[PDB]
Amino acid sequence: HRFVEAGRLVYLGDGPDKGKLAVIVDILSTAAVLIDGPTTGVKRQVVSLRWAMLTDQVINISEKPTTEQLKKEIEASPAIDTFMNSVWGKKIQQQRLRAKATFEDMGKIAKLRRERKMAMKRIAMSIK
Amino acid sequence: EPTLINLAREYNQNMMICRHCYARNPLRATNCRRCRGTNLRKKKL
Amino acid sequence: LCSSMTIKVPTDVECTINKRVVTVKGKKGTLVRDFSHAPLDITHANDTISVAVWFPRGKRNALPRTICSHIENMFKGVTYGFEYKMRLAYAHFPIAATVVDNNKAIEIRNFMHQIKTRRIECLPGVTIAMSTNVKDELILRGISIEDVSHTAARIHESLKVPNKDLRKFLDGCYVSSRGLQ
Amino acid sequence: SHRKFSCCRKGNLGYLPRKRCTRGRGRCKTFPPDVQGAPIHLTAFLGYKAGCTHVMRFIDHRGSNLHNRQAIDQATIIDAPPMICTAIIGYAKTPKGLRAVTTVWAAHIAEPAMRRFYRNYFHAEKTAFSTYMKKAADGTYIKEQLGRLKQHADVIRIVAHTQPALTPLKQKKADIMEIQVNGGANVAEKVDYAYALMEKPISIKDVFSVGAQIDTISITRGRGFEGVVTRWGVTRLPRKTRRGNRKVACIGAWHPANVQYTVARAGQMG
Amino acid sequence: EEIKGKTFLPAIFVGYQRSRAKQRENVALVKVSGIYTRAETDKVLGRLIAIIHSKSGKPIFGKICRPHGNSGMVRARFYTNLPGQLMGHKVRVFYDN
Amino acid sequence: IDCKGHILGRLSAIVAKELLHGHEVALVRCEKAIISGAFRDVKAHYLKKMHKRTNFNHLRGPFHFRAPAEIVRRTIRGMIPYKTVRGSDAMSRLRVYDGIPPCCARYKRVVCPSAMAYLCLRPERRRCEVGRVAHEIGWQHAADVERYEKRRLEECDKWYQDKIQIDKKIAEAAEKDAELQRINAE
Amino acid sequence: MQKYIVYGRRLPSEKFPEPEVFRMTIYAPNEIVAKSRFWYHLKSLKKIKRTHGEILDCQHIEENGDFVKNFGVLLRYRSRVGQHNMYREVRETTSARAMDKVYSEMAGQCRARYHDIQIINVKEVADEDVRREKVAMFTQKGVRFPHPCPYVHVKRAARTRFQDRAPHV
RNA sequence: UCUAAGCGCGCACCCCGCCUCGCGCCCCGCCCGGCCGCGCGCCCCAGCCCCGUGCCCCGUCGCCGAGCGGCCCCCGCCCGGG
RNA sequence: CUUCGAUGUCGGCUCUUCCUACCGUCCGCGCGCACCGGCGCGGAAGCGUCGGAUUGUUCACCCGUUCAAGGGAUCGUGAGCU
RNA sequence: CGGAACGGCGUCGGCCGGUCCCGACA
């Protein structure tokens, strides 16, 4: 299950476009692949398959589809939405939000995280 | 006896010996299993 | 690149493959072989088991076919069985082979007038019987080729002349026929 | 250069260190294998060497010249007065080895056992087991603790004490020794057999049989500081050696630069 | 103590800025938690940190000055100099000031 | 840290650094750690490493501990400055056990993925468990450690069945001030 | 790495007022190495040293990288035994990127550095003309293979190190 | 086709036992007393059964008890003979 | 090259250790291996490799026997000896 | 894993020739 084929939505594990969604277009080798992300921010690039973890959704794609043809299909296909509403999708959105947190914000959250640890002790003691 | 002597010769006499390894090796062998890639075989009656 | 091979499942045998453990069920029994020692995508695919190794390099390419053959030996062994026939070969001294237990072990005595007694215990799933019509011959019958083959190698290994010229002293128990019936 | 003439090392190096034994008396160290479902039996007994006699025996050994012939052979008498069993130790085999669960003692321990527990019985305060005799003697304590052994132990042993009053020895204190109970169908069969013997004499006639073989275990006769020739068996040097002939002439070579553990040295023999 | 409701982000004083030849006890290397990248270190740069002296019980304050390697370790300077028996002991980058 | 599947050297180096940050690590199930390479060769290395001993007195010499946790501990004493106080104290902070003993059964255990042999080591690099090499060099508790880890697992599962049941009650208490923190914690 | 078309000729002389202008297409990291490689060839090929010559242009070509093509390169390389000729095919978006792949493969398998390798020609083989099975395997219309290295998401473990469970792949 | 996966047998060698020493620890007896900590599913990675999280606050407000896991405490000589 | 305001200088005796480039014993395999024997080869340093005549001799040589490899350790071994 | 002449049907990569839908006697 989950294969490197044209259209597979790929999460970008590393690189300039980490944390972004793209579609495989052509496979140069097992090592590489040409991905582009018109709906997202990824421009057309050749990335190593290492930097791109496969996601279950595969988008319908015309062979060698440029950026404009690929965008029409990527916009029409409901695959990006299905992945973004998924458990992996929701985590990616949550991870995106976490990165933009100032030192002042990191403190806010740490107080609200200690408050939770204590709340669970108060609740677990209650569950007798 | 005859056939049983042939069956025993199959398991005891029909082989190929590598001259360096001295290893028993099949009769259609090209290279010795132990003396890796050593191509020199024989077997005597 | 996928190096694939395919085997066709006989309908005499109902086979289940989970993980890399393959269980075949046949008239003569159920055999279970685990192939998790190697990287293979074995698939049921209607009536065809396909081993399917992926990205094969030097010996990964070798794996698809041994597994497919190890599975068809399981299918054949459950459907027909395996009988390896072993003929005791001697000259001056007759070998005495006695089948013991519920036909689950053998004792070979009088090898070259030796006071030693050599009992070889058949592996679980192989039964040793004497020839009903062949003379000086042992029939090893079981559903597993590896079990029936290993049991017969031990019987051959037990009867080994100590020193001497094995070419002149060609006595021993030797596998004569290996076959499904 | 080489020694030039092959000769073995004088001495066994598995009997090293050759030091005076720190253990008080001979200890068993290991016990006979447990063996499952055998007849239940006691593995060891403590005795005191008495003497040696020499016996005439009829030897039925076929293949020996002395078959259906007569032999005078040395034999050693060991005095073995009955031993009172006083306790029952259970050990559970664990990842760290056998670790004792508990040792349950009898409600009454005889004076020779108590004597072992104090250096001078007369000037001793005699407090040993004082609270324990009160906690025991109700019956319930022993059973509840024996129940702990049945549930959490694998190796049940009986702790026995020799009676020195029945011996010509000047000891007056009982040698206390653990003896394994082997052959039980279940652990509970061993503890139950042990309870029958608790606070009661056990005799050699029950423990061993004529014709059976026994491993004697004891501390040897002592000769004190002894020289290399007597202690290790080294050859006395020729009579003209200045500094004496009773020594190992070279204790090593220039390299390794320290004297080796395998080189014979003077010290305690016995 | 001056620090009571000061929340803090856990950190550890790993050791002095050293080479396998020469040690510089003036600057101390601190591993701030949740910071694994030299670029991540910017968020905690120029911030007050403290190490509680183990004999005294009182805080030796200091500031985080600059990043040490690509893996987050920061270089920090303290009002005095850390005694060297305080390596591995925790440092506290306060969320407040 | 459960050393099940952890490559000996690659886990030890992650642990040695945490011992030097004053972290008080305890390593359980060391017997299940993995040494890369054919067993016959791994055993041969551990049997060659046991041949080095001070000729004059072997009791003055290197000590070869045959137990899996004692091998694992010597691996860390190599990647630690032990003669110095910083490293001698760090060596004190380490507790290593084969199996999960009763002392460590009730602690929460983590696993370092970077040092595990499924992610590291290609399929085919011939893995070897530490315990097997230990019984070949001379550990005497291989069977006793398994027999206890079989009974430990049996209680673990009985406890888990009760734990799944209790957690439902804990999770069912999702109404309180905890929701207020969750909404803010974004 | 970059791709340059370098034009150069011998200096004008009284016996030869106009000298011949020679153009070569050199794949090199920088303009200075491209000019250096050009002169190495024009010394051996046409007996023109840099001292006796002028480089009239070292143009940089920015080839379009939108779609993958198959490239076919022929090179001459020098081993510790002696010079050898070799044809390597590579599927890459551009020729400059194709020489990076070839140089990387020649460094790793043939232990050959850039200065040993001389590039006789690079060309775009069509899917029909590809002669290497590594290249041909992916020329096919629909090529689907599992992720070759999905365990390589261990990039999480450095940042994480300890984790409650061992992650599935 | 003994080997590449898989498997059997296998050396006066090696490792273990038995044996010699044994730091520590254990159980018990006398004594039964303080001090400390707060936290448990398992497997498998060519099913990986839904993943790519979590914890991220050991004082930062946490510290009762309960239960478990610890740790410490504890134990004569002279003299006479062997 | 290092030691000459000094590192005692051959063989024997005595004593330990070490190596393998293995003579016998062990395990396989090969012979122009019928057997007995020999002989070649790979693994193998656990044990054994002795008593004497001449010589200061190591070596040599011869006699004998359970038939007898080779070496290293400041050419091991002088506040050990001769 | 200082290292040689020489071996390798270990595995990858090349160069150059020969046959194969005139199926590599049926």
Tab-separated table of N, CA and C in Angstrom, chain B residues 1 3-13 24 43-45, chain C residues 86-90 136 156 166-167 169-171 174-176 178:
chain	number	residue	atom	x	y	z
B	1	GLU	N	27.052	-56.101	-4.251
B	1	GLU	CA	26.047	-56.477	-5.275
B	1	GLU	C	26.066	-55.429	-6.410
B	3	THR	N	23.579	-53.035	-8.502
B	3	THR	CA	22.916	-51.698	-8.480
B	3	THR	C	23.283	-50.973	-7.186
B	4	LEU	N	23.260	-51.676	-6.058
B	4	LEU	CA	23.588	-51.076	-4.738
B	4	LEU	C	25.035	-50.584	-4.763
B	5	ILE	N	25.938	-51.313	-5.416
B	5	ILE	CA	27.335	-50.801	-5.559
B	5	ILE	C	27.291	-49.517	-6.393
B	6	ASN	N	26.468	-49.469	-7.439
B	6	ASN	CA	26.317	-48.229	-8.240
B	6	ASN	C	25.709	-47.112	-7.389
B	7	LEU	N	24.722	-47.416	-6.540
B	7	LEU	CA	24.093	-46.407	-5.641
B	7	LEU	C	25.134	-45.943	-4.618
B	8	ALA	N	25.935	-46.849	-4.084
B	8	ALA	CA	27.009	-46.428	-3.171
B	8	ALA	C	28.061	-45.604	-3.898
B	9	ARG	N	28.438	-45.975	-5.124
B	9	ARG	CA	29.463	-45.238	-5.912
B	9	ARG	C	28.922	-43.842	-6.197
B	10	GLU	N	27.609	-43.729	-6.339
B	10	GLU	CA	26.993	-42.407	-6.562
B	10	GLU	C	27.271	-41.529	-5.350
B	11	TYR	N	27.241	-42.107	-4.153
B	11	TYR	CA	27.370	-41.288	-2.923
B	11	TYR	C	28.802	-41.303	-2.425
B	12	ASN	N	29.627	-42.216	-2.924
B	12	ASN	CA	30.991	-42.331	-2.355
B	12	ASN	C	32.098	-42.083	-3.377
B	13	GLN	N	31.862	-42.274	-4.678
B	13	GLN	CA	32.998	-42.198	-5.640
B	13	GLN	C	32.768	-41.133	-6.706
B	24	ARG	N	35.389	-31.955	-1.493
B	24	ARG	CA	34.480	-32.707	-2.378
B	24	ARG	C	33.623	-31.658	-3.064
B	43	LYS	N	39.083	-36.430	-9.072
B	43	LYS	CA	38.396	-37.665	-8.523
B	43	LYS	C	39.059	-38.934	-9.077
B	44	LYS	N	39.346	-39.948	-8.249
B	44	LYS	CA	40.134	-41.115	-8.733
B	44	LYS	C	39.380	-42.399	-8.391
B	45	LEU	N	39.594	-43.481	-9.150
B	45	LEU	CA	38.857	-44.754	-8.931
B	45	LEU	C	39.813	-45.800	-8.359
C	86	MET	N	15.400	-45.757	1.015
C	86	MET	CA	16.836	-45.839	1.360
C	86	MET	C	17.280	-47.296	1.376
C	87	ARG	N	18.254	-47.669	0.558
C	87	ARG	CA	18.590	-49.105	0.492
C	87	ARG	C	19.861	-49.368	1.287
C	88	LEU	N	19.799	-50.274	2.265
C	88	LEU	CA	21.016	-50.640	3.024
C	88	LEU	C	21.912	-51.426	2.083
C	89	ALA	N	23.148	-50.975	1.911
C	89	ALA	CA	24.103	-51.646	1.018
C	89	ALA	C	25.181	-52.261	1.897
C	90	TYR	N	25.449	-53.554	1.737
C	90	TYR	CA	26.479	-54.247	2.551
C	90	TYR	C	27.189	-55.332	1.748
C	136	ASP	N	15.629	-54.949	2.035
C	136	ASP	CA	16.822	-54.166	2.459
C	136	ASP	C	16.534	-52.692	2.200
C	156	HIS	N	21.729	-41.864	6.843
C	156	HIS	CA	22.950	-42.076	6.028
C	156	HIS	C	24.196	-41.728	6.828
C	166	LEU	N	36.730	-45.526	1.381
C	166	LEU	CA	35.263	-45.522	1.226
C	166	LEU	C	34.908	-45.969	-0.190
C	167	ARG	N	35.816	-45.786	-1.147
C	167	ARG	CA	35.582	-46.270	-2.530
C	167	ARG	C	35.501	-47.796	-2.557
C	169	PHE	N	35.237	-49.783	0.351
C	169	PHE	CA	34.256	-50.166	1.394
C	169	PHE	C	33.002	-49.324	1.180
C	170	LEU	N	32.282	-49.552	0.088
C	170	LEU	CA	31.103	-48.710	-0.226
C	170	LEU	C	29.827	-49.294	0.396
C	171	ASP	N	29.778	-49.389	1.730
C	171	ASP	CA	28.582	-49.907	2.451
C	171	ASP	C	27.902	-48.744	3.178
C	174	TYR	N	21.797	-45.689	1.713
C	174	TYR	CA	21.847	-44.561	0.747
C	174	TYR	C	20.444	-44.270	0.218
C	175	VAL	N	20.062	-42.998	0.109
C	175	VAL	CA	18.734	-42.658	-0.478
C	175	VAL	C	18.741	-43.106	-1.937
C	176	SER	N	17.774	-43.925	-2.321
C	176	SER	CA	17.758	-44.436	-3.703
C	176	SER	C	16.740	-43.642	-4.509
C	178	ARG	N	13.718	-40.469	-4.397
C	178	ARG	CA	13.034	-39.388	-3.652
C	178	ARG	C	11.821	-39.025	-4.492
